[PDB]
């Protein structure tokens, strides 16, 4: 497994969810321009692993075929100890793509391959998010 | 199953519907929608080797689109717009086939899902005044 | 039949027409339409190895387009605009062939169908003042 | 005989013309047109291994375009703009070849035909003040 | 000949020029033009295995462009702008080669020719104050 | 060496830095920059098989970007914006890899370098308040 | 020679320069230019297996660009802007390599040359205050 850089702040409760992700969901707000909540289903598992309070007015879901990889990954975030995740654009190997939240401060173009989990911290909002892939 | 169920999105309201055939694939599908309420209201679905039209929800909407689908043609680009929550609704659908055919009906102002892809084999959900909830279904 | 029938779309009005030949395929097809009423009004259709012009509905409209079609050339992109309902009408047609040839006729302001694809072999429907109803037909 | 005749479009007026060679192909084509009247007025056509210019209609127009055509080069995109009816006229022509060459002449404000495609082998029609009527011609 | 002569376009005025070799192809070519008069005024042409610079017409124009041409590089996109008539002139030239090189010179406000294509092997025409008349020439 | 040193561009000011590892490559890089001063201010760099974060210059800037880089992924498109002269500075960087990944940081209003390409293996330069000077380094 | 000389363009002024090495190729190249005078003013050129910087003309200009060039990377798109005449000057340069790298320097307001393509092996010309005259040079 390959662990992307966790970006955003140091706040909120630790989460680590790690089969392959076969669905992912991003709750976000216009009022605060933050990611607030994430859920993640796995490949042969009905269980929904979730984190942070879904207090936001939009959500998007990306379903992901068994053979489909992420080729284009970007997380928007505010940098610093006092930080937060603000947005995410993902693009797959089949042209599928999702845009969530805002990109007004800092960015990371992450590592690419088959998305295998996420890790970070979450409270009111998503304090910190880093992706995980295969080789 | 020999089948992949997309996430049913929208609300928990209306009457359960499930359209599939023992060895059939969707060969045609229709979406009624309104400008006044920005909702999907009605759906119909024919299948291969079967004249029967399976329908659901009240077609009270002022537009409709139909996609016919060749026997060997797959869905490669699928998106459902919807309002999230227990008290939710479907608002729009874009489909794109494996032959460049594309239909786009509805509004996408709140929430989205980019679904799974393959040979469209049925739909599942709930419907009343409008389409409360919709999830697609594919082969392997 | 050795034939695939597109959904006839539009209303139930006007006189039934059906154009197909024992061993022809459509070689030419014309669409008359108006700006004043935003309707298809008239259609004509020549066939391979046959000089006869098969026509329907009154050509009262201020524009027309013709698509000529090579012997080996297929339809890959077919769309009919229409008003839905028992008291309905066809409003427009975009066709695209397998050589990049394409025609746009009339208006697409209410409802659409993306039809099935193959070698265009005839048309069927009803016509009066205007084209009440149109469905295409292909080989397999 | 070994030839495909596009539909002659436009009116029934002016003097008959038919330009073809026993085993030759058009190697150059010219279109005179006006801004004042938005008509094609004059055409000329040389053929392969033959310096003679076959011409028709009065060149009273303020623009002209010439398409030269390589020996192996085909027309893949052909369109004639025209006013429909017994009382009709040709208004414009777009041609596109198999090397990306293309020419645009005149106006397309009333009616169109997307013609048949292949190696252009002659033209036929009628011409007077202007080009009353034009149909193209191809090999197999 | 082993050669294909594009149509000389423009007027009948000025002194005859013909730039050719028994076995040579243009290696470079230059177009002088003015903004004041919107005409081509002067041309120069080197050839492969010949240090002679062949020129014609008075270079009284305020811009020039040069296209150098690799040994294996062909013209795939050739156009000459010109005023038609006995009393005529060349106004512009766009060339595009087989390596994406291209030059644009002068103006295209009246008439055009899309010429034949191949490896450019000379030019021929008439020139005085300006370039009265220009035609290109290719191999087979 | 086993390397290729791009040109260090910008000024001669600040403290010398050099980040390289004995048989390893940059696996991640970060650029801090400001809107207020239109400068690169700080850089950090992780390497393959090494948890250490090597950094330089004061991160007083209001934006940062990070590029992670797969083990087999190369830089194919590299550009550094900078103010030239003894009293100079780096103002921006665009990088593009062999997987379409790309990052933009800072401003490009004065001077540029399109660098050498291959596997990014370290950076070298000088830094103080800001990044006085930056040059990249690749594997031969 | 085993070398191809681009046409030197611009004026006849300034001191002759010629940069070439017995078996090497340009590995780097730099263009100083001004907004105040819209001229190229200075050029520098490193070569393969040689740290020496060969330069010419006074760098009095407010911008510079550098193109680094991989060992196997060729120029596929080369253009020099210049004022023509005995009293002439170079105003700009666009280069494009065989890896998508490209640089734009100075102004293209009067005259151009699209040069010969291959591996850049040196430059020659004249320079003073500014770059009076520049021609490129390639291998076979």
Measured between beta carbons, the chain A residues lying within 8 angstroms of B112 are 60-61, 98
Nearest to E16 by CA among E139, E137, E123: E123
Q: Which two tokens stand for residue B9?
A: 């999105």
Other beta carbons within 10 angstroms of residue G121's beta carbon come to 21
Cβ of D101 within 8 Å of Cβ of E112? The answer is: no
Cα of first residue to Cα of last residue in chain E, in angstroms, is 10
Method: X-ray
What CATH number does the domain located at A2-133 have?
Answer: 2.100.10.30
Q: Would you mind telling me the total number of residues written for chain E in this entry?
A: 140
**DSSP letter, residue B48:** T
Q: Which two tokens stand for residue E90?
A: 């060349």
Q: Give the torsion sign (CA, A108, A110, A116, A119).
A: negative
D38 SS3 class: coil
Order of strands across the sheet that contains F40-47: A97-101, A84-92, A70-78, A106-109, F63-68, F26-33, F40-47, F50-56
The residues after which chain F has a C–N gap greater than 2.5 Å are none
Nearest to D115 by CA among D96, D131, D132, D101: D96
Q: Which two tokens stand for residue C26?
A: 């459509």
Cβ of A60 within 8 Å of Cβ of B9? The answer is: no
Interface test with B, best of C9, C83, C113 (most B CBs within 10 A): C113
Q: What is the resolution of this structure in A?
A: 3.1
Do A55 and A96 contact (CB within 8 A), yes or no?
A: no
Dist. CA B121–CA B118, nearest whole Å: 9
Dist. CA G42–CA G106, nearest whole Å: 12
Dist. CA B27–CA B10, nearest whole Å: 25
Strands (E), D1-140: 4-5, 9-10, 15-20, 26-33, 40-47, 50-56, 63-68, 75-83, 89-97, 102-106, 111-114, 120-127, 131-138
Strand partners, F77: F96
Task: Compute CA B74 distance to the chain's CA centroid, rounded to the nearest angstrom.
Answer: 15
Cβ of F9 within 8 Å of Cβ of G66? The answer is: yes
Nearest to F119 by CA among G70, D9, C129: G70
Dist. CA G106–CA G112, nearest whole Å: 12
Q: Would you mind telling me the total number of residues written for chain G in this entry?
A: 140
Backbone φ/ψ region at A55: left (φ over 0), alpha (ψ -120 to 50), beta: alpha
Other beta carbons within 10 angstroms of residue D41's beta carbon come to 25
Half-sphere exposure of G107 (CA within 13 A, CB side): 14
Other beta carbons within 10 angstroms of residue F76's beta carbon come to 17
Other beta carbons within 10 angstroms of residue D98's beta carbon come to 15
Interface test with G, best of E66, E100, E102 (most G CBs within 10 A): E66
Dist. CA C65–CA D111, nearest whole Å: 6
Nearest to B43 by CA among B121, B133, B118: B133
Alpha carbon distances (Å) from E12 to B15, B135, E90, F3, F61: 84, 75, 11, 66, 70
Measured between beta carbons, the chain E residues lying within 8 angstroms of D102 are 114
Q: Which residues of E touch G (CB under 8 A)?
A: 28, 62-70, 99-103
Order of strands across the sheet that contains G40-47: F102-106, F89-97, F75-83, F111-114, G63-68, G26-33, G40-47, G50-56
Rg (CA), chain G: 14
Provide, for chain B, the percentages of residues in helix, strand and coil under a 3-state DSSP scheme, each rounded to the nearest 5.
Answer: 0, 60, 40
Nearest to A86 by CA among A106, A68, A67, A72: A106
Q: Which two tokens stand for residue E64?
A: 């020039």
Task: Compute CA B125 distance to the chain's CA centroid, rounded to the nearest angstrom.
Answer: 9
Interface test with G, best of E30, E68, E75, E104 (most G CBs within 10 A): E68
Dist. CA B105–CA F61, nearest whole Å: 46
Cβ of G64 within 8 Å of Cβ of F84? The answer is: yes
Q: Give chain A's largest Cα–Cα span.
A: 39
Nearest to A15 by CA among A105, A126, A133: A126
Beta strand B75-83 pairing with B111-114: antiparallel
Do E68 and E111 contact (CB within 8 A), yes or no?
A: no
Beta strand E26-33 pairing with E63-68: antiparallel
Alpha carbon distances (Å) from A97 to A62, A90, B78, B114, C49: 8, 5, 11, 7, 50
Architecture of domain D4-138: Aligned Prism (2.100)
- To the nearest 10°, the Cα dihedral for B6, B7, B13, B15? 20
Cβ of D66 within 8 Å of Cβ of E110? The answer is: no
Tokens 């703009």 map to which residue? D81
Nearest to C58 by CA among C127, C134, C125: C127
Dist. CA B65–CA B43, nearest whole Å: 10
Alpha carbon distances (Å) from G86 to A80, E41, G33, G83: 62, 19, 21, 10
- To the nearest 10°, the Cα dihedral for C71, C74, C78, C80? 30
Nearest to G133 by CA among G6, G4, G34: G6
Do D110 and D82 contact (CB within 8 A), yes or no?
A: yes
Do A16 and A117 contact (CB within 8 A), yes or no?
A: yes
Q: Smallest CA–CA separation between E65 and chain D, in Å?
A: 23
DSSP chain G: ---EEPPPEE-S-SEEEEE--TT--EEEEEEEE-SSS--EEEEEEEETTEEEEEEES----SEEEEEE--TTPPEEEEEEEEE-STT-EEEEEEEEETTS-EEEEE--SSEEEE---B-EEEEEEEESSSEEEEEEEE--
Interface test with G, best of E28, E64, E67, E75 (most G CBs within 10 A): E64
Half-sphere exposure of B57 (CA within 13 A, CB side): 30
Dist. CA E69–CA G115, nearest whole Å: 8
Do F6 and F125 contact (CB within 8 A), yes or no?
A: no
Strand partners, B29: B45, B67
Beta strand G63-68 pairing with F111-114: parallel
Residue F1 burial (C-beta neighbours within 10 Å; 0-12, 13-18, 19+): exposed
Task: Count Cβ–Cβ pairs < 8 Å, chain B vs chain C.
Answer: 37
Nearest to D61 by CA among D19, D31, D94: D31
Measured between beta carbons, the chain G residues lying within 8 angstroms of E104 are none
Q: Would you mind telling me the total number of residues written for chain A in this entry?
A: 135
By C-alpha distance, the chain A residue nearest F103 is: A109
Angle formed at CA G63 by CA G62 and CA G65, multiple of 5 degrees: 160
Per domain, the residue ranges of chain B are 4-138
Alpha carbon distances (Å) from G116 to E67, E97, E139, G82, G138: 9, 12, 21, 17, 8
Dist. CA B28–CA B54, nearest whole Å: 11
Tokens 């196997």 map to which residue? G72
Of B62, B64, B100, the CB nearest to C77: B100
Other beta carbons within 10 angstroms of residue D77's beta carbon come to 17
Residue E72 burial (C-beta neighbours within 10 Å; 0-12, 13-18, 19+): exposed
DSSP B25-39: -EEEEEEEE-SSS-S
Do B27 and B48 contact (CB within 8 A), yes or no?
A: yes
DSSP A18-58: -----EEEEEE-SSS-SEEEEEEEETTEEEEEEES----SE
Q: Which residues, 6+ apart, have CB-to-CB distance to G88 below 8 Å?
A: G9, G10, G11, G12, G13, G82, G132, G133
Q: Which residues, 6+ apart, have CB-to-CB distance to G69 below 8 Å?
A: F116, G25, G26, G27, G28, G29, G97, G101, G120
Nearest to E20 by CA among E116, E93, E95, E124: E124
By C-alpha distance, the chain F residue nearest A70 is: F99
Dist. CA G43–CA G133, nearest whole Å: 12
D69 SS3 class: coil
A134 SS3 class: coil
Q: Which two tokens stand for residue B42?
A: 């009605």
Do D133 and D6 contact (CB within 8 A), yes or no?
A: no
- b/e sequence C25-61, b meaning 16+ C-beta within 10 Å: bbbbbbbbbbeebbbbbbbbbbbeeeeeebebbebeb
Of D77, D110, D113, the CB nearest to C66: D113
Dist. CA C106–CA C128, nearest whole Å: 17
Dist. CA E54–CA G120, nearest whole Å: 28
Q: Which two tokens stand for residue A61?
A: 């879901």
The CATH number, out of the four listed (3.40.190.10, 2.100.10.30, 1.10.3720.10, 1.10.10.10), of the domain defined by the range F3-139? 2.100.10.30
Cβ of E68 within 8 Å of Cβ of G7? The answer is: yes
Tokens 């790690």 map to which residue? A18
**Chains D and E touch, contact meaning at least 3 pairs of CB atoms under 8 angstroms apart:** yes
Order of strands across the sheet that contains C75-83: B50-56, B40-47, B26-33, B63-68, C111-114, C75-83, C89-97, C102-106
Tokens 């062939």 map to which residue? C97
Other beta carbons within 10 angstroms of residue A12's beta carbon come to 19
Dist. CA D22–CA G130, nearest whole Å: 65
Task: Compute CA C48 distance to the chain's CA centroid, rounded to the nearest angstrom.
Answer: 17
Dist. CA A14–CA F95, nearest whole Å: 33
Q: Smallest CA–CA separation between D85 and chain E, in Å?
A: 30
Task: Compute CA E8 distance to the chain's CA centroid, rounded to the nearest angstrom.
Answer: 10
Q: Which helix (H) or strand (E) holds F7?
A: none
Strand partners, E68: E28
Cβ of G68 within 8 Å of Cβ of F116? The answer is: yes
D116 SS3 class: coil
Dist. CA C85–CA B62, nearest whole Å: 10
- To the nearest 10°, the Cα dihedral for A46, A49, A55, A56? -70
Half-sphere exposure of A63 (CA within 13 A, CB side): 23
The residues after which chain C has a C–N gap greater than 2.5 Å are none
Dist. CA F129–CA G9, nearest whole Å: 45
Other beta carbons within 10 angstroms of residue C74's beta carbon come to 16
Nearest to C66 by CA among D88, D3, D7: D7
A62 SS3 class: strand
Of E84, E114, E115, the CB nearest to D64: E84
Dist. CA E12–CA E128, nearest whole Å: 11
Q: Which residues, 6+ apart, have CB-to-CB distance to B32 below 8 Å?
A: B40, B41, B42, B43, B57, B59, B60, B61, B63, B64
Q: Smallest CA–CA separation between A134 and chain B, in Å?
A: 21
Cβ of B114 within 8 Å of Cβ of A62? The answer is: yes
| Three state DSSP letters for chain E | CCCEECCCEECCCCEEEEECCCCCCEEEEEEEECCCCCCEEEEEEEECCEEEEEEECCCCCCEEEEEECCCCCCEEEEEEEEECCCCCEEEEEEEEECCCCEEEEECCCCEEEECCCECEEEEEEEECCCEEEEEEEECC
Task: Compute CA G86 distance to the chain's CA centroid, rounded to the nearest angstrom.
Answer: 19
Dist. CA E103–CA B51, nearest whole Å: 62
Q: Which residues, 6+ apart, have CB-to-CB distance to A128 below 8 Å?
A: A6, A7, A8, A9, A10, A11, A12, A83, A85, A120, A121, A122
């Amino acid at each position: 497994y390959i662990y992307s850089t966790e970006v955003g702040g140091v706040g909120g409760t630790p989460f680590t969810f790690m089969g392959t992700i076969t669905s992912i969901k991003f709750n976000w707000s216009d009022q605060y321009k933050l990611l607030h909540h994430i859920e993640v289903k796995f490949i042969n598992n009905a269980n929904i692993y979730a984190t942070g309070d879904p207090k936001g007015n939009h959500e998007v879901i990306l379903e992901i075929d068994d053979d489909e990889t992420i080729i284009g990954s970007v997380i928007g975030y505010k940098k610093g100890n006092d930080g937060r995740c603000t947005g995410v654009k993902l693009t797959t190997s089949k042209g599928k793509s999702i845009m969530a939240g805002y990109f007004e401060e800092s960015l990371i173009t992450t590592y690419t391959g088959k998305l295998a989990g996420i890790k970070g911290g979450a409270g009111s909002a998503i304090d910190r998010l880093g992706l995980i892939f295969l080789k």
